[PDB]
Design an enzyme around this catalytic site. Structure first.
Site, PDB file in Angstrom:
ATOM      1  N   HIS A 231      -9.406   2.458  -2.581  1.00 54.91           N
ATOM      2  CA  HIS A 231      -8.025   2.206  -2.160  1.00 54.91           C
ATOM      3  C   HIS A 231      -7.329   1.313  -3.183  1.00 54.91           C
ATOM      4  CE1 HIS A 231      -4.534   1.818   0.249  1.00 54.91           C
ATOM      5  NE2 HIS A 231      -4.963   0.983   1.180  1.00 54.91           N
TER       6      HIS A 231
ATOM      7  N   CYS B  54       0.783  -1.241   0.000  1.00 53.56           N
ATOM      8  CA  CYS B  54       0.000   0.000   0.000  1.00 53.56           C
ATOM      9  C   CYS B  54       0.838   1.329   0.000  1.00 53.56           C
ATOM     10  CB  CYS B  54      -0.948   0.206   1.208  1.00 53.56           C
ATOM     11  SG  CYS B  54      -2.213  -1.024   1.258  1.00 53.56           S
TER      12      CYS B  54
ATOM     13  N   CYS C 249      -0.483   3.470   6.140  1.00 53.04           N
ATOM     14  CA  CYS C 249       0.021   2.216   6.672  1.00 53.04           C
ATOM     15  C   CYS C 249       0.296   1.253   5.530  1.00 53.04           C
ATOM     16  CB  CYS C 249      -0.966   1.603   7.666  1.00 53.04           C
ATOM     17  SG  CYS C 249      -2.448   0.839   6.976  1.00 53.04           S
TER      18      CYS C 249
ATOM     19  N   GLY D 239       9.449  10.340   5.591  1.00 48.32           N
ATOM     20  CA  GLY D 239       9.810   9.402   6.632  1.00 48.32           C
ATOM     21  C   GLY D 239       9.203   8.044   6.379  1.00 48.32           C
TER      22      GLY D 239
END
Length: 419
Positions: free
Chosen positions: A373, A88, A404, A304
């Site tokens: 998604h 993802c 995530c 990050g």
């Protein structure tokens, strides 16, 4: 000039599983958004130094989907491209990899983004090559296997979401209110045409005529928390039942006790969907912006990554957002707009408690529970949605995008709007 800029970006509308984009291959969806993003960015394709594109359900799509996207978009054979596989997070990982290339001195303009046609992922036979011999075998769903199944605990991402419900103590009602707010916000955004700027149309076949597909298909209208309160659970709870055993890479602070602990709370309505779509991002150094007179949307001021236990992968963004915000030299109080991908209301609630999100600032146009998604693309998709809404709001000067990652990670990016 040593700085990094998103010059422009865009996205397809997102299709439902089996829906409007089912017949549009990932490479084609990617090419549409890359060509359009270069166009809006006013960058000649031949001035692109590399294309990096996320796509994870690559089974039987041929050699190197990213290179297919690049060539189909009009970028020359001389420009290398490669496919980024980070489940993802792939679409956002492409941005991080593009930023690293620029800072290393290897490039000045990188096309970034992702594409995924989940509808098109095939079924596989592991036995056909060397022989089944005797006895029924399995046809593997590569969408579930490569996209939605944990490789170390042998259950679905929805079961990791139930793990988070148990460890963090999240009620079913809280998840249903979260999902209802998301649909309500998207319905309002759709009725206002808020996605009009960022969407590029895709031409699809309806019978014998080409038609433009330019509106997100997945949202559901008239969704309330009560209306979805009666659905059954979609996934089994973890084998560790109400007390999963995890290794923590951060120390949680938002853990509470809930009465429905150890029961099925994740449902079709409070989780994200399976979807098709693509999104592209034109990343450029200040040197490139100045040499070609570009007009960027935003400065990339930090990024990050993070790693967490696969059992609770949905809190990956907590580490990833902390790393990105610190590289940007900012706190959550400096952030004006937030796109935290709605993989599950379960993990979205947990991440928000840990990062102390001000919900009024989160997913102001709705998130993936409503919009869908497409796994390889959504990490770029949420950046597209973040930057366009910041563009709309005079006061929204800094933005955070995070999501995530199956297998136990997260990525995050922090932006400062250009003026």
């Amino acid at each position: 000039m040593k700085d990094l800029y998103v010059v422009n970006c865009c996205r397809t509308a997102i299709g439902s599983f089996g829906g409007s984009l089912k017949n549009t291959p990932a490479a084609e969806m990617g090419a549409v958004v890359v060509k359009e993003a270069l166009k809006r960015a006013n960058v000649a394709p031949e001035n692109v130094d590399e294309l990096m594109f996320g796509c994870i359900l690559t089974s039987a799509q041929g050699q190197n989907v990213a290179r297919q996207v690049s060539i189909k978009a009009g970028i020359p054979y001389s420009v290398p491209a490669y496919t980024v596989g980070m489940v993802c997070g792939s679409g956002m990982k492409s941005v991080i990899e593009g930023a690293r290339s620029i800072l290393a001195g290897d490039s000045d303009i990188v096309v970034c983004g992702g594409t995924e046609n989940m509808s098109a992922a095939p079924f596989a036979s592991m036995d056909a090559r060397w022989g089944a011999r005797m006895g029924d075998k399995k046809l593997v769903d590569t969408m579930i296997k490569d996209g939605l199944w944990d490789a170390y605990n042998n259950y679905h991402m929805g079961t990791t979401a139930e793990n988070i419900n148990d460890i963090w103590g999240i009620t079913r009602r809280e998840q249903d209110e979260f999902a209802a707010a998301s649909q309500q916000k998207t319905e309002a955004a759709q009725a206002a045409g808020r996605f009009d700027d960022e969407i590029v149309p895709v031409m699809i076949k309806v019978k014998k005529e080409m038609v433009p597909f330019a509106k997100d298909e997945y949202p559901k209208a008239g969704v309330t928390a009560d209306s979805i309160a009666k659905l059954k659970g979609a996934f089994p709870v973890g084998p560790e039942s109400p007390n999963p055993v995890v290794v923590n890479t951060f120390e949680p602070t938002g853990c509470q006790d809930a009465p429905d602990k150890g029961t099925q709370r994740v449902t079709a309505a409070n989780a994200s969907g399976i979807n098709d779509g693509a999104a592209a991002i034109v990343l450029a150094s200040g040197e490139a912006v100045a040499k070609y007179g570009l007009k960027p949307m935003a400065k990339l001021i930090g990024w990050g990554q993070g790693g967490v236990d696969p059992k609770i992968m949905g809190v990956g963004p907590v580490v990833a957002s902390r790393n990105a915000m610190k590289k940007a030299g900012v706190t959550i109080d400096d952030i004006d707009l937030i796109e935290a991908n709605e993989a599950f209301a379960a993990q979205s609630i947990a991440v928000a408690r840990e990062l102390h999100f001000d919900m009024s600032k989160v997913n102001v146009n709705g998130g993936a529970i409503a919009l869908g998604h497409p796994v390889g693309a959504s990490g770029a998709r949420i950046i597209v949605t973040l930057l366009h809404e910041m563009q709309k709001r005079p006061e929204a000067k800094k933005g955070l995008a995070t999501l995530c990652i199956g297998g136990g990670m997260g990525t995050a990016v922090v932006f400062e709007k250009c003026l």
